[PDB]
Amino acid sequence: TTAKEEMERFWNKNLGSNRPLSPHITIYRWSLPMAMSICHRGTGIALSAGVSLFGLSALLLPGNFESHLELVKSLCLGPTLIYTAKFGIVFPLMYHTWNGIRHLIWDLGKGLTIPQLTQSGVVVLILTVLSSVGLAAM
Amino acid sequence: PRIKKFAIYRWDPDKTGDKPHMQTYEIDLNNCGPMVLDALIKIKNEIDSTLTFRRSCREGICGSCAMNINGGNTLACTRRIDTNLDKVSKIYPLPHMYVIKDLVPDLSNFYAQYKSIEPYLKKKDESQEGKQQYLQSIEEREKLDGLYECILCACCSTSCPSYWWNGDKYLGPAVLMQAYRWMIDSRDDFTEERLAKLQDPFSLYRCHTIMNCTGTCPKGLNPGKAIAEIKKMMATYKE
Amino acid sequence: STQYPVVDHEFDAVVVGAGGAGLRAAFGLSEAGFNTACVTKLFPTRSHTVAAQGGINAALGNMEEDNWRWHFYDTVKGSDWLGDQDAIHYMTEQAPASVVELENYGMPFSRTEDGKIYQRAFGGQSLKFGKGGQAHRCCCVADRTGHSLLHTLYGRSLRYDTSYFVEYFALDLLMENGECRGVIALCIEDGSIHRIRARNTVVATGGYGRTYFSCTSAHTSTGDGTAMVTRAGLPCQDLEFVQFHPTGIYGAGCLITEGCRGEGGILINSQGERFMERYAPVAKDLASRDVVSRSMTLEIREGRGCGPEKDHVYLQLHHLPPEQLAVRLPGISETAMIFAGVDVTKEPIPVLPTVHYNMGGIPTNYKGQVLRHVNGQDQVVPGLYACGEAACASVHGANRLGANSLLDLVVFGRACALSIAESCRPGDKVPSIKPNAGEESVMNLDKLRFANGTIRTSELRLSMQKSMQSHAAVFRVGSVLQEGCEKILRLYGDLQHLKTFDRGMVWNTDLVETLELQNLMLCALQTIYGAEARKESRGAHAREDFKERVDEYDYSKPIQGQQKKPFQEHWRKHTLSYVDVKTGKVSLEYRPVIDKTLNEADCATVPPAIRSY
Amino acid sequence: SSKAASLHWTGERVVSVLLLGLLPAAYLNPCSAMDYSLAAALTLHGHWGIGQVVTDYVRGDALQKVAKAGLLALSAFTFAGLCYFNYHDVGICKAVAMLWKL
Ligand SMILES: Cc1cc2nc3c(=O)[nH]c(=O)nc-3n(C[C@H](O)[C@H](O)[C@H](O)COP(=O)(O)OP(=O)(O)OC[C@H]3O[C@@H](n4cnc5c(N)ncnc54)[C@H](O)[C@@H]3O)c2cc1C
Ligand code: HEM
Ligand SMILES: CC(C)Oc1cccc(NC(=O)c2ccccc2C(F)(F)F)c1
Ligand code: SF4
Ligand code: F3S
Ligand code: FES
C-alpha cells in the first residue's frame, strides 16, 4: 500500500461515516501571534478592497477627483470626524505595513522563536499606533 | 482533601446516534500523580472505564497521548494538572481531526503524509551499504540537533490553521520538519529531488508563518523555523 | 463466528511486534522479498524501544583498539553462565555489521573528531578479556538512541511492501499439529477479528515489567507474546530472571539511564559515602546491574537510605562539566527535571531499583527458531520464531549487560529474517487452516467483553502488581516466595470473577487492558513459581536461603578431582515453565545451557568462574 | 520539472520590498512615474495576496476556477482604473496629498 493510496483510503473511510470532527476554533487558546496573523489578512483584504474601489470608481463613476473632494468637503465635515475617517484609513495600512516587514524578516529566518515573536508582535502594535496617530495628524 | 473538576470530551461510536458531549469527573489530587494522564488513568481505573485514550510511555517520549488540554496541544503525560482548584480542566482530542472514539483521533493521514516524504537515507551508490560506517563530522551532525527528536505526536501539525483547512494537501509542520531533517543530512544524496517534490501551491506553501506549531511543540522543537529554512533552500537550489 | 465478523489474510510472514526487533525482522523479511505482514498493537514508533536512552554495543573500535571477542567474554561473564555462548558469539560478532547497517540506514549517531560513530563506557565492559580496564564500545545517538534506532528502522521499512496492521491486538497463535500458521488478532479500530496466516510467524512482543508495581517499562509492556506461547502449550525459559535497573525515579518509576554512570556520574547514599566502592572495589558504580541494585537495596534495609521516609538512594550528575549534560544527557536533563523538579546540573537525582528488563521469554535458537522440550532435548517448532525482550535465546542469561538489548533487537531481528530467507522461498505454499481455527481466542474475547463479575480489571491487576512486588523483588526467600505463589495462584482463579464495563466494538481500552491482564498473570505465574523452585543465587535472582552459585562443579576450587554433579542436582540450567490454561497450574522442567560457541578456533568457550565485579 | 512554486513565492517577496520601497519614495518624490509603479506594485501585490486567501479557503476545482478568474478581472480592472486616474486625473500621489490637507 503506497502513501497516495493510504491517503485516498483515509478520505473515503472517514467522509462516509458517522465520525464527528473534533472542535478547533471553538476550543483553541488565542495567542497573540494567531490574532496578529488574522489581522494581517483582514487588513490586507480591506486594503485591497479600498484600492480596487479607488480603481473601479475611477472608471465606472463620473466627475474628477476635485469634483469628488468638493462633494466630500461640503458635508459640513467635523474636524475630529475627519481625523476618525483619516486614522481609520492609516491604521490598517500601518499595522499591515509594519507586520509586513516582520514577515519578510521571518522569510529570511531571523526572529523565529516564541520570545522574539512576542517581542516583535508588541513592537509592531506600538509602531502601528505611533505611525497611525502620527500620520492621521500630518 | 482537594477535589478537582475535569471536563472531558466524549463520544461513543457504538452508542447509536450519540453525539459529542462533555463529561465531568472529580479527582482527589492527594490520591493522584502530578500529570494529567495520571488523572486520566485514575478516572479510567477507579470511575468510568469507558473513557478511552491512547497512552504508553508516560515519559513524554513516545507521542501516544497527545491531546488538547485547556485549549493547547500537549502530551498529557508531561503537562501537570492545574492545582488551582477554581479552574476546571478541559480535555479535548486533537483539533480538526476525525474522532474514532472519545479522545482518539484518526492519524492515518498524518502517517500517510509522513510516509510520502520518504523519511530515510537515500544514497546514489547503495552497492556499498551495510559494510562501512559513513563519515559525518561533528559539525555536520550538529545540523540534525533539534530536528531528529521529533516524536510525531502530531501536536504541531494539528495546531496549524492551514492544516486545519488544507491538511489533505498541506503536509503540515510535523512532516515538513522531517523532510528538512533529511534535506540537511550530509549523508543523503537526494536533497534537490526532495525539494522538487514540494513545488506546488499546497505541500509546503500553505505555511503562512502563523507559528502555532513551534508554540505548541511539547518537546521544545521549532518546526516553523524549519519550514522557513526549506523555503529559503527552495528559492535558491539550481537545477 | 456469526456475531464477530472474521477476515482472513494470507502472507509469507507475520511479525507480531514493531519495536527494534519487530521492525528489523519485518523489514528484513520484506527486503529479502517476502510478502510480509507486521501486526502491532501500537503505532511502531510508540513501541517501547523509543524510551531506550543509553546505547547499542558493538566492538567497532572507534574509541580504542577493540575486539568483539572481548565483548563476547563480557556478555557471557554478565550472563552468570546461564548465557548460551553460541548465541553470545553470534551476537557480539555480528554487532559491528549490525550497527554499521543502522548508521547506513540514516541513524544519526553522535560523532567523533574522526567523523565516526561515537562510543562510550557502560556497565561492566572490559578490554583484553577482563584485564584491560574499562572499555568504550557503546554506540549512541546522544541520550535518545532508542528513539533514533526505532525511527530510522520504521522509516526504512516504508521503503518496502511491509503490510502494517497498526493497532491490531494479537490474541493467539494459529498452531496446527505442532506447527505455526500465523496469528489471530483483534483490530482495535472496528472491533472485528482477523486471521493473518503465514508460513512463518515471528514473535517480538517485548517484556512484561507491568506484572510489577514499580517498573520502568511502558503501560504496553504486558507479556502478550510470552502469553500466546504459553497458551499454545509451549515453554517459557527463565521467567524468574527479572532485572531491577538500579536508577529508576522514586515516584513515577521512570528510568535515568546507566549512561549517567558511564559518563563519570556517581551513586551517593545518605551518609556522604560513594557506597558503590565498598561493595565492588574493582568496577565501582559502573559495575553489573544485578550487583548495583542489590547494593542500593541492601543499603536501604540498614537505613543508609535517604529522602523523606528513608527508602531511596541518590544518583549524582552535578559535578561533570555542565557542558557534558547538554550533549550526552539531554533526555534525562529534561525528564529528571519534569518528574522530580530537579536541576540535574546542580542537584543529584532521587533514584531506586525498579523492574526494567526481562532476560526470560520464549526459548530460542541462535537462529531465532523457537524451541520446545521433547524427551529432554530441543526441538524446533516449525514456522515459529521470536526475538527481543519477548524472546530468550538467553544471550543475557541471569543478568543482561547494559546496552546489549538494543543490540539483541537488531541482531536477532535480522537473524529471524535470515533464517526464513535461507530455509524457504516467498510464494511457498501457505499451509491450510481449520475453519474452526481461532474459535477459542474469540470466545474468550467475548466473555471478557460482557463480564458482569464482582472484581474490576484495574483492582485485580493492582493486587498482582503489589504481590509480585512484595514477593518477587530484588531479595527473596522460600517463605516469602511460596506465600506469593499461592497468593498469585488465588488471583489467577479470581480472573473468573472480573468486571469490565465498556461493552463496545470500537477502541475498547477496557476489553484489551483486561486481555492484557490475562497475559500478565501467565507471565507472573511462571515468574514467581520458577523463582521459588530455583534454590540458588545467580544473576538477578538472589536467594537469602541459598546465597550460593550452584554449578555442575564448585568452580572456585580448581576443576580436576571434583565429582561432577548430575543434571538434577545443580541449578546451572534453564528453567522451562508451562501453565495449565484452565487451572493456573504451573508445571516446570529444565534444559541445559549451551557452552560450545559457534567455533572454538574463532571464539573460545569461557568456562564458569567466580563472579566478582 | 519547473520550479514554479518557489519562483512565485520569491516574486511575492520581491514586489513586497519594492512596494515597501515606494511608500517612502512617493512621499519624497511624487510624480507621474511613482504614480504608475505605485499602481503596478499595489495591484500586483494585492492580486497575489488574495490569490493566497483564495487558494486557502476556496475548496474544489469548481469554485477555485471562478474565484481565480473573477479575481484576475478585478485586478486588471483595478490596474486600468488606477492608470486611468494617473493619466486623465490628479494621480495617486497628488490625490492622496490633496485628500490629506482637508
Ligand atoms: C527506560 C528504558 C531504557 C532502556 N534503555 C536501554 C538502552 O539504553 N540500551 C539497551 O540496550 N536497552 C535498553 N532498554 C531495554 C530495551 O530497550 C528493550 O528490551 C527493547 O526496547 C525491546 O524491544 P522489542 O522490540 O523486543 O520490544 P518493544 O520495543 O517493547 O516492542 C514491542 C512491540 O510489540 C508490540 N505488541 C505487544 N503486544 C502486542 C499484541 N498483543 N499484538 C500486537 N503487537 C503487540 C508492540 O506494539 C510493539 O510494537 C531500556 C528499557 C527501558 C524501559
Ligand atoms: C509596504 C507595504 C506592504 C508590505 C511590506 C506588505 C507585505 C506583505 C507580506 C509580506 C504579505 C505576505 C505575508 C504572508 O502571508 O506570508 C502580505 C500579504 C498581503 N498584503 Fe501586503 N504589504 C504591504 C502593503 C499592502 C497593501 C497596500 C495592500 C492592499 C492595498 C496589501 C495587501 C495584501 C494582501 C491582500 C495580502 C494577502 C493577505 C494574506 O495572505 O493573508 N498589502 N503583505
Ligand atoms: C481560534 C482562532 C484564533 O484561530 C483561527 C480561526 C480561524 C482562522 C484562523 N486563521 C486563518 O485562517 C489564517 C490567517 C492568516 C493566514 C492564513 C490563515 C489560514 F492558513 F488560511 F488558515 C485562525
Ligand atoms: S514537532 Fe514537536 S510537536 Fe510537531 S510532532 Fe515532532 S514533537 Fe510533536
Ligand atoms: S502553525 Fe501552521 S502555518 Fe506555518 S509555521 Fe506553523 S505551520
Ligand atoms: S504517553 Fe508516551 S508521550 Fe505521553
PDB file of N, CA, C and O in Angstrom, chain A residues 104 107, chain B residues 205-206 208, chain D residues 5-19 44-45 47-53 55:
ATOM      1  N   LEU A 104       8.624  39.494   6.304  1.00  0.00           N
ATOM      2  CA  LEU A 104       9.816  39.413   5.441  1.00  0.00           C
ATOM      3  C   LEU A 104      11.067  39.007   6.196  1.00  0.00           C
ATOM      4  O   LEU A 104      11.862  38.212   5.696  1.00  0.00           O
ATOM      5  N   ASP A 107      10.848  35.495   6.709  1.00  0.00           N
ATOM      6  CA  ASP A 107      11.153  34.830   5.438  1.00  0.00           C
ATOM      7  C   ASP A 107      12.648  34.551   5.335  1.00  0.00           C
ATOM      8  O   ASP A 107      13.058  33.466   4.889  1.00  0.00           O
TER       9      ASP A 107
ATOM     10  N   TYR B 205       3.541  25.259   0.731  1.00  0.00           N
ATOM     11  CA  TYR B 205       3.274  26.693   0.658  1.00  0.00           C
ATOM     12  C   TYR B 205       1.988  27.165   1.324  1.00  0.00           C
ATOM     13  O   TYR B 205       1.614  28.331   1.211  1.00  0.00           O
ATOM     14  N   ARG B 206       1.332  26.281   2.057  1.00  0.00           N
ATOM     15  CA  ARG B 206       0.230  26.708   2.915  1.00  0.00           C
ATOM     16  C   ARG B 206       0.769  27.295   4.208  1.00  0.00           C
ATOM     17  O   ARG B 206       0.087  28.069   4.876  1.00  0.00           O
ATOM     18  N   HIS B 208       1.769  29.815   6.243  1.00  0.00           N
ATOM     19  CA  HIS B 208       1.768  31.281   6.263  1.00  0.00           C
ATOM     20  C   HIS B 208       2.395  31.840   7.560  1.00  0.00           C
ATOM     21  O   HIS B 208       1.946  32.850   8.091  1.00  0.00           O
TER      22      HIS B 208
ATOM     23  N   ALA D   5       6.549  26.956  -8.107  1.00  0.00           N
ATOM     24  CA  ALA D   5       6.088  27.292  -6.762  1.00  0.00           C
ATOM     25  C   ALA D   5       7.068  28.199  -6.024  1.00  0.00           C
ATOM     26  O   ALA D   5       6.647  29.164  -5.378  1.00  0.00           O
ATOM     27  N   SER D   6       8.365  27.902  -6.128  1.00  0.00           N
ATOM     28  CA  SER D   6       9.383  28.680  -5.404  1.00  0.00           C
ATOM     29  C   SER D   6       9.623  30.060  -6.021  1.00  0.00           C
ATOM     30  O   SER D   6       9.920  31.012  -5.306  1.00  0.00           O
ATOM     31  N   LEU D   7       9.470  30.175  -7.339  1.00  0.00           N
ATOM     32  CA  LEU D   7       9.578  31.475  -8.008  1.00  0.00           C
ATOM     33  C   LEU D   7       8.489  32.431  -7.559  1.00  0.00           C
ATOM     34  O   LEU D   7       8.775  33.550  -7.131  1.00  0.00           O
ATOM     35  N   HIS D   8       7.242  31.980  -7.666  1.00  0.00           N
ATOM     36  CA  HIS D   8       6.089  32.788  -7.284  1.00  0.00           C
ATOM     37  C   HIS D   8       6.251  33.296  -5.850  1.00  0.00           C
ATOM     38  O   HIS D   8       6.000  34.469  -5.577  1.00  0.00           O
ATOM     39  N   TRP D   9       6.686  32.418  -4.944  1.00  0.00           N
ATOM     40  CA  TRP D   9       6.931  32.805  -3.551  1.00  0.00           C
ATOM     41  C   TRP D   9       8.014  33.877  -3.486  1.00  0.00           C
ATOM     42  O   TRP D   9       7.880  34.829  -2.711  1.00  0.00           O
ATOM     43  N   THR D  10       9.061  33.724  -4.312  1.00  0.00           N
ATOM     44  CA  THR D  10      10.120  34.744  -4.472  1.00  0.00           C
ATOM     45  C   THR D  10       9.636  36.040  -5.139  1.00  0.00           C
ATOM     46  O   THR D  10      10.060  37.143  -4.759  1.00  0.00           O
ATOM     47  N   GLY D  11       8.780  35.906  -6.149  1.00  0.00           N
ATOM     48  CA  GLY D  11       8.217  37.068  -6.819  1.00  0.00           C
ATOM     49  C   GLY D  11       7.517  37.908  -5.784  1.00  0.00           C
ATOM     50  O   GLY D  11       7.828  39.088  -5.612  1.00  0.00           O
ATOM     51  N   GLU D  12       6.593  37.258  -5.079  1.00  0.00           N
ATOM     52  CA  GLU D  12       5.819  37.857  -3.998  1.00  0.00           C
ATOM     53  C   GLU D  12       6.691  38.706  -3.089  1.00  0.00           C
ATOM     54  O   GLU D  12       6.433  39.901  -2.947  1.00  0.00           O
ATOM     55  N   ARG D  13       7.715  38.088  -2.489  1.00  0.00           N
ATOM     56  CA  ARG D  13       8.658  38.799  -1.603  1.00  0.00           C
ATOM     57  C   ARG D  13       9.220  40.056  -2.268  1.00  0.00           C
ATOM     58  O   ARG D  13       9.170  41.150  -1.688  1.00  0.00           O
ATOM     59  N   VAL D  14       9.743  39.885  -3.484  1.00  0.00           N
ATOM     60  CA  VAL D  14      10.334  40.987  -4.239  1.00  0.00           C
ATOM     61  C   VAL D  14       9.403  42.189  -4.307  1.00  0.00           C
ATOM     62  O   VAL D  14       9.767  43.272  -3.849  1.00  0.00           O
ATOM     63  N   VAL D  15       8.208  42.018  -4.862  1.00  0.00           N
ATOM     64  CA  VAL D  15       7.338  43.191  -5.034  1.00  0.00           C
ATOM     65  C   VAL D  15       6.997  43.788  -3.660  1.00  0.00           C
ATOM     66  O   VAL D  15       6.926  45.009  -3.522  1.00  0.00           O
ATOM     67  N   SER D  16       6.848  42.935  -2.642  1.00  0.00           N
ATOM     68  CA  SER D  16       6.589  43.399  -1.264  1.00  0.00           C
ATOM     69  C   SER D  16       7.680  44.329  -0.740  1.00  0.00           C
ATOM     70  O   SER D  16       7.375  45.291  -0.034  1.00  0.00           O
ATOM     71  N   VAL D  17       8.939  44.066  -1.089  1.00  0.00           N
ATOM     72  CA  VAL D  17      10.001  45.010  -0.720  1.00  0.00           C
ATOM     73  C   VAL D  17      10.000  46.187  -1.715  1.00  0.00           C
ATOM     74  O   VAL D  17      10.225  47.336  -1.315  1.00  0.00           O
ATOM     75  N   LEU D  18       9.724  45.917  -2.993  1.00  0.00           N
ATOM     76  CA  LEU D  18       9.586  47.009  -3.969  1.00  0.00           C
ATOM     77  C   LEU D  18       8.532  47.965  -3.470  1.00  0.00           C
ATOM     78  O   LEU D  18       8.754  49.164  -3.436  1.00  0.00           O
ATOM     79  N   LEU D  19       7.405  47.415  -3.050  1.00  0.00           N
ATOM     80  CA  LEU D  19       6.300  48.202  -2.536  1.00  0.00           C
ATOM     81  C   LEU D  19       6.617  48.855  -1.186  1.00  0.00           C
ATOM     82  O   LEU D  19       6.133  49.949  -0.878  1.00  0.00           O
ATOM     83  N   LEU D  44      -0.481  44.389  -8.351  1.00  0.00           N
ATOM     84  CA  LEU D  44       0.163  43.080  -8.447  1.00  0.00           C
ATOM     85  C   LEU D  44       0.193  42.391  -7.066  1.00  0.00           C
ATOM     86  O   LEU D  44      -0.306  41.279  -6.896  1.00  0.00           O
ATOM     87  N   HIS D  45       0.775  43.080  -6.087  1.00  0.00           N
ATOM     88  CA  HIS D  45       0.881  42.577  -4.720  1.00  0.00           C
ATOM     89  C   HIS D  45      -0.455  42.109  -4.170  1.00  0.00           C
ATOM     90  O   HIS D  45      -0.537  41.038  -3.599  1.00  0.00           O
ATOM     91  N   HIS D  47      -3.164  41.294  -5.769  1.00  0.00           N
ATOM     92  CA  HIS D  47      -3.728  40.245  -6.602  1.00  0.00           C
ATOM     93  C   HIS D  47      -3.173  38.871  -6.204  1.00  0.00           C
ATOM     94  O   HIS D  47      -3.912  37.891  -6.104  1.00  0.00           O
ATOM     95  N   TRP D  48      -1.864  38.809  -6.005  1.00  0.00           N
ATOM     96  CA  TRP D  48      -1.218  37.610  -5.492  1.00  0.00           C
ATOM     97  C   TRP D  48      -1.652  37.295  -4.066  1.00  0.00           C
ATOM     98  O   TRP D  48      -1.779  36.134  -3.695  1.00  0.00           O
ATOM     99  N   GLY D  49      -1.869  38.344  -3.280  1.00  0.00           N
ATOM    100  CA  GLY D  49      -2.249  38.214  -1.889  1.00  0.00           C
ATOM    101  C   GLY D  49      -3.572  37.509  -1.791  1.00  0.00           C
ATOM    102  O   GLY D  49      -3.669  36.451  -1.166  1.00  0.00           O
ATOM    103  N   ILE D  50      -4.590  38.080  -2.432  1.00  0.00           N
ATOM    104  CA  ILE D  50      -5.928  37.471  -2.428  1.00  0.00           C
ATOM    105  C   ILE D  50      -5.847  36.075  -3.081  1.00  0.00           C
ATOM    106  O   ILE D  50      -6.548  35.135  -2.670  1.00  0.00           O
ATOM    107  N   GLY D  51      -4.963  35.953  -4.074  1.00  0.00           N
ATOM    108  CA  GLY D  51      -4.578  34.666  -4.618  1.00  0.00           C
ATOM    109  C   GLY D  51      -4.501  33.657  -3.499  1.00  0.00           C
ATOM    110  O   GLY D  51      -5.207  32.659  -3.520  1.00  0.00           O
ATOM    111  N   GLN D  52      -3.682  33.957  -2.493  1.00  0.00           N
ATOM    112  CA  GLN D  52      -3.419  33.032  -1.378  1.00  0.00           C
ATOM    113  C   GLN D  52      -4.654  32.827  -0.513  1.00  0.00           C
ATOM    114  O   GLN D  52      -4.931  31.706  -0.095  1.00  0.00           O
ATOM    115  N   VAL D  53      -5.388  33.903  -0.247  1.00  0.00           N
ATOM    116  CA  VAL D  53      -6.627  33.800   0.515  1.00  0.00           C
ATOM    117  C   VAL D  53      -7.586  32.873  -0.206  1.00  0.00           C
ATOM    118  O   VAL D  53      -8.335  32.112   0.428  1.00  0.00           O
ATOM    119  N   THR D  55      -6.689  30.440  -2.568  1.00  0.00           N
ATOM    120  CA  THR D  55      -6.242  29.045  -2.581  1.00  0.00           C
ATOM    121  C   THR D  55      -6.373  28.370  -1.206  1.00  0.00           C
ATOM    122  O   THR D  55      -6.535  27.148  -1.134  1.00  0.00           O
TER     123      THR D  55
END
